[model samples]
Target: NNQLTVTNNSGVAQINAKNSGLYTTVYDTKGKTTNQIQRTLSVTKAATLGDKKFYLVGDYNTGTNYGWVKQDEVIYNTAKSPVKINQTYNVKPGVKLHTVPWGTYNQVAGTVSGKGDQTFKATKQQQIDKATYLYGTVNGKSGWISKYYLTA
Candidate 1:
């Protein structure tokens, strides 16, 4: 689950999200991996075009529960609102979602239809090479979308 980390009063306009280009993600051990780790990263560590938060973790096998389980794959999370990821967001009438970034694929995994905002987990670099797409979870599912449709 992933959602943007908004500051106090939901006033997180430090700069333009696309402009700041600051991406974020979770990691396991030295360099990268969401498998085994002496440590793990959250929105605080991953950055735009930053670490392997995208390459190693998102693309390849996350990791095994070597010791501490490090984490069952990089689980998208937020240091912000605790219950909101499970919450919802208002979306377009025919909003779509996917296992990966939507643009990268022609077919979406499924669609979340209703009259409310799509549920979110935390923010991520769904497009590992770029830090623009809104990658996260909706209704307990993983997918990516253009930030144009997402909100804080």
Candidate 2:
């Protein structure tokens, strides 16, 4: 059932070997690894994460491939590639862009404290691309909008 995955929402995933370090271990389905993935071979994401095992498949497989790479080691256009930098986006009506990528930080400014009633908002939709942080000029405010918030 190893179908040659010909397309990816993001650009081809490169093993990013150059950026990966010694401790950078791409593992098998042995259920290991988190927050890292590398270029080991330029391929699209698998139907599921488990499909890829490491080392057995050589990096840069012309056939097709998958697997975890080192964190920040890989860089390519992701599912978020269609959006362009400095472009105009809607931020989905009520949406407001954040200074951070996921809006994970807002407590330091402190309106509430520790997760509840977060000062930051925009619940959902995503990240991926040559651009790690999603950005767009929207409703007079702009920069770092979530990919899905581009609002068609």
Candidate 3:
């Protein structure tokens, strides 16, 4: 199993991979088999260009309350587009979750609320962006997974 950690740093982004290999079997010169070997590759960490942001929007049905909520927020950029990292989750009934690409919308500041609608402003940069909206019914809630990239 491979685990990756993505962190956003203003103009710099980092990616850390925990594991990157699989278990294997080995044999000796005499055709004798040794115990199974479980090895793990060294963790990998890299830095890339562009900015990062996350958006979590969806509804939840916990047998009682059934409403929508934005779990994640959005990020904006000017010289480049927002980047989205893939993620997965199991949602419950009446619950909805979304993991969308920040690059989808322009780099504009906007208001994102579940209670009431409001106006928002994005500081002058280059792009205006908002979090992905996750809206739908929830059934045996789990989670969401996705993959994305960044561009200029």
User: Best candidate per TM-score, number?
Assistant: 1
Q: What clash count goes with each model?
A: 14, 16, 35
lDDT of 2 by residue, 16-128 (tens): 43533323223332333333233323333432234533231213315433344432444443444333333333333444555334333330111212322222222333344
Q: Taking the tens digit of each residue's C-alpha lDDT, what string does model 3 give over 52-121?
A: 2221111111222111111111121212333333322232222222322122122112222344322221
Task: Work out candidate 1's RMSD over C-alphas.
Answer: 14.0
Q: In model 2, where is the ten-residue run with the lowest total lDDT?
A: 107-116
Candidate order by decreasing lDDT: 1, 2, 3
Scored by lDDT, model 3 comes in at 0.21
TM-scores of all candidate predictions against the true structure:
0.35, 0.27, 0.17
**Residue-level lDDT tens digits of model 1 in 1-152:** 33323222210011111221222332333332222222222222222222222312222114222211112233343333222133334455466765443232333656766676655555554332323455566666676565667666
- In angstroms, how far off is 152's CA in candidate 3? 23
Candidate 1: stretches off by over 4 Å: 1-90, 102-105, 126-131
Error of 3 at 111 (Å): 9.0
Worst 10 residues of 3 by lDDT: 65-74
lDDT of 2 at 92: 35
